[PDB]
C-alpha cells in the first residue's frame, strides 16, 4: 500500500514535523548543580528516560514512520535514540555558547562533564556541534527535518525509507529556497547540514560505548526501558 508521506507537500511536511515536536522537559529540581558521578548520571538518566517516552510518540507522528512494520519501527528507534536526544540537546543549547542546556533548569558546562569518566570528551563534541549550528543560524524548520532524517537513516541497510528521505531532502531545499538562498548556497547548505549528521552519529557511537559498559550501568539504577535501549547496541559490542 502507498504511504501518505509522499503525497504531502513541502509545507504540509514542515507543519507535520513542527506539530509533532516533543516538549522541552525539566530536570528534577531535587538535586541542584551536580558535581559527582552519581548526581550527574542520576539527573541525565532520569531526564533521558522521560524524553524517550515523548520520542516514541514523536516518531509515530513522523510521516512515513507509521507505514513501516512494527519490527522496522523498533529497529530505527533502537538505532537512533541517542542521536535524537543529542541533536535535541545541541539545538536547545544554541543560544547558550559554552554551555549544554539539558533542561531549562539544568544548564551544564564542560567542567561538570569531568564528574563522569569519559563524559567531558562527548560534552566537548556536543558544545562544538551546538556552536556549528549557531554559526550556521540553523532554523527550527531545518532542525525538525534533520531530526526526522536521523530517525529514518539510523539503520545501516529499503525503498519506502529512501523515498521518504528524498521527500525530506526536497523539504530542506524548499525551506532554503523560501529563505532566499541561491542554488549554489542551497546545495552548499544542504551538504553542511548533512555532514554534521556524521558527527552526531560519531557522538552517539562514542557515548553509547560508555553508556553500555558495566561501570556506566552500575553508577545508578536504570529504568527497564533505558536498559533495553542500551542492550540493543551492547549486543553488537565486543566480548
Amino acid at each position: 500500500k502507498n504511504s501518505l508521506a509522499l503525497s504531502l507537500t513541502a509545507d504540509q511536511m514542515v507543519s507535520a514535523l513542527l506539530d509533532a515536536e516533543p516538549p522541552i522537559l525539566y530536570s528534577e529540581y531535587d538535586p541542584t548543580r551536580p558535581f559527582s558521578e552519581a548526581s550527574m548520571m542520576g539527573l541525565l538518566t532520569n531526564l533521558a528516560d522521560r524524553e524517550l517516552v515523548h520520542m516514541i510518540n514523536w516518531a509515530k507522528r513522523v510521516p512515513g514512520f507509521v507505514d513501516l512494520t512494527l519490527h522496522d519501527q523498533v529497529h530505527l528507534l533502537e538505532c537512533a535514540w541517542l542521536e535524537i536526544l543529542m541533536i535535541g540537546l545541541v539545538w536547545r543549547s544554541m543560544e547558550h555558547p559554552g554551555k549544554l542546556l539539558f533542561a531549562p533548569n539544568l544548564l551544564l558546562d564542560r567542567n561538570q562533564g569531568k564528574c563522569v569518566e569519559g563524559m567531558v570528551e562527548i560534552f566537548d563534541m556536543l558544545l562544538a556541534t551546538s556552536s556549528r549550528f549557531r554559526m550556521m543560524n540553523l532554523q527550527g524548520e531545518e532542525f525538525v527535518c534533520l531530526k526526522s532524517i536521523i530517525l529514518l537513516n539510523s539503520g545501516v541497510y529499503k525503498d519506502h525509507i529512501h523515498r521518504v528521505l528524498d521527500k525530506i531532502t526536497d523539504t530542506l531545499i524548499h525551506l532554503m529556497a523560501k529563505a532566499g538562498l541561491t542554488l549554489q548556497q542551497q546545495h552548499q547548505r544542504l551538504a553542511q547540514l548533512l555532514l554534521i549528521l556524521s558527527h552526531i552519529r560519531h557522538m552517539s557511537n562514542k557515548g553509547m560505548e560508555h553508556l553500555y559498559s558495566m561501570k556506566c550501568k552500575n553508577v545508578v539504577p536504570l529504568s527497564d526501558l533505558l536498559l533495553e535501549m542500551l542492550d540493543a547496541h551492547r549486543l553488537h559490542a565486543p566480548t
Binding site: 512494527l70 523498533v74 528507534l77 527497564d224 526501558l225 533495553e228 535501549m229
Partner: peptide, 11 residues
C-alpha cells in the same frame, strides 16, 4: 524477549 518498545509503539 518481549520488548517495552514493542508495547509503547502500539497505539
Amino acid at each position: 524477549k518481549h520488548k517495552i518498545l514493542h508495547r509503547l509503539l502500539q497505539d
